[PDB]
Amino acid sequence: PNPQEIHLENVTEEFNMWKNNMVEQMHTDIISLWDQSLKPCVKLTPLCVTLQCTNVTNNITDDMRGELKNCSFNMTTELRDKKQKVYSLFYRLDVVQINSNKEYRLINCNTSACTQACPKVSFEPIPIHYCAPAGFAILKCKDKKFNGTGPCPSVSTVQCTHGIKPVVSTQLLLNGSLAEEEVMIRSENITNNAKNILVQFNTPVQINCTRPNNNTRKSIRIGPGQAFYATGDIIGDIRQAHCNVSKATWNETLGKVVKQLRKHFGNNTIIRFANSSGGDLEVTTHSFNCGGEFFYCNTSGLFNSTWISNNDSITLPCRIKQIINMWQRIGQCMYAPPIQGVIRCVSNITGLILTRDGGSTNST
């Protein structure tokens, strides 16, 4: 308890965010801790089977493309001689067609068989306090207007840092640590293009994310002792997962971040926020976890504005995947098992990650 925040006088320490240590070490620590938390859970090599899928019991409209498929297939029992014909529900982002008739297979069977996370373990972040070993010290820059590089005139030594929640979010970093008075932008070189601009603002904007179906999980026994948690029936209506952000608070925080970002590009410049340019689905869209389920929520409803030199809510839709490929390794997955009931999580967006456009041609 009571970690000794010890102030020092007359000290000018040269901090650097971008060539820092403690971040590649933290990244290797969190991916190795991810790897060690999957070894005792089961392996899903007997599931790469030719699935026969169909459409879910639903009024199929042609414009709305259904994110659920109803797939039935053979699977071994714990008795090796016998097999059972079982059925489950999958998302369309997890199966692929094999070529009339329709036959599907999983998305990863020609790359890597992979592991269902055994659901006694959970995925919410708990705070980790990093500590220095004996014979080392940890310095903390207590300055307020500190953009992240150079001298800091008020440092303080700490034995063990404060609560760091490891969240995995791609854009719109959630549950972060707020600023003190302003909204702070920071960059390694702001006149560069390839370096992201990290934005952290003072008062958070809360975000309410949900999926409103109640999945009923079922246990399909693969073999002796190994069970596979599939999606059974959807009772009630099927709907799309979404997230809500307060419109007035989002417009106010974008006004604050424009008022801050005009200090680096002249005051008479027209700042225009556009949506993401393209790429894989884990970067074009806001990816996060919520109660042990992985959301991929569209983001074009927020980053769409044009700012000139002078109780409603934004609903943004989501798609959810069961097979992840986090950290982008070569032979890994994680089959996240489904969660019973509807899912709701409330969090507080504290920051953003932006990227300029590499403009030529007289651009104002």
Epitope: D63, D237, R239, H242, T315
Partner: antibody, heavy 132, light 105 residues
Framework: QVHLQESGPGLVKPSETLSLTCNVS????????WSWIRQPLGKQPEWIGY???????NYNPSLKSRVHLSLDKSKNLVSLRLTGVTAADSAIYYC??????????????????????????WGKGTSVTVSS | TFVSVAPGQTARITCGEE??????VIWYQQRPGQAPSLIIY??????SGIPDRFSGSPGSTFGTTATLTITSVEAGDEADYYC????????????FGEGTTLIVL
């Protein structure tokens, strides 16, 4: 005050196009949606279709080609044209008004709702039958 | 599918397949010989001219048959009833529910 008047042949020979008209009272035809209701003897009635101006003329997909509905702006009527009289359509017929209404069960912008109908007032029916 | 209760008592006349999603049923009456007549045009509200004693089950319950509850039955209720159901998962029904009539003593 509304009351409707169905009018048709009643006795139809097979392989002929059945036609039927519906005279109106009280209000005219254009300002609301109209519907045709079939009922064979001693069972559930089935709904044939519903009409309105500006393309709101969906039919029973079981029939979908064997029947064409139409409007009478000039005489203030609404008509039915059936094609290929079988033995099954020997039934009582009804022209009847209908009112729409939206059942909303989710996010409104995600097209997560539907439109249910209901026939409020009815005519008297016409027992059309086929003979040989 | 006939049901007969003594006059003055209550009756629960049921119709339709089990519920899958949210639904907005409607309920129709057919006195013998004449045209039909609307009774309930949503789950649980009725048009004017149609009296009370015509209560219905709500639509929000999942996995539940479409029923119609009458109290204080009389001789005017001797007619045919019909459900016409609009499930938000199964497609639209161009034919009514099964004819389940009701006679009184």
């Amino acid at each position: 005050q509304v009351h409707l008047q169905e009018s048709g042949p009643g006795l139809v020979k097979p392989s002929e196009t059945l036609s039927l008209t519906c005279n109106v009272s009280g209000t005219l035809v254009r300002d609301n949606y109209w519907s045709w209701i079939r009922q064979p003897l001693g069972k559930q009635p089935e709904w044939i279709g519903y009409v309105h101006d500006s393309g709101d003329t969906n039919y029973n997909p079981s029939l979908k080609s064997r029947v064409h509905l139409s409007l009478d702006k000039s005489k203030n009527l609404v008509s039915l044209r059936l094609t290929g009289v079988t033995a099954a359509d020997s039934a009582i017929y009804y022209c009847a008004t209908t009112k729409h209404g939206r059942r909303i069960y989710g996010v409104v912008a995600f097209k997560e709702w539907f439109t249910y109908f209901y026939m409020d007032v009815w005519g008297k029916g016409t027992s059309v039958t086929v003979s040989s | 599918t006939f049901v007969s209760v003594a006059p003055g008592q209550t009756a629960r006349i049921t119709c339709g397949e089990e519920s899958l999603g949210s639904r907005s049923v409607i309920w129709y009456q057919q006195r013998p010989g004449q045209a039909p007549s609307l009774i309930i045009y949503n789950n649980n509200d009725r048009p004017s001219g149609i009296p009370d004693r015509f209560s219905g089950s709500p639509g929000s319950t999942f996995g539940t048959t479409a029923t119609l509850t009458i109290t204080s039955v009389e001789a005017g209720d001797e007619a045919d009833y019909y459900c016409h159901i609009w499930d938000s998962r199964r497609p639209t029904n161009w034919v009514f529910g099964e004819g389940t009539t009701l006679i009184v003593l």
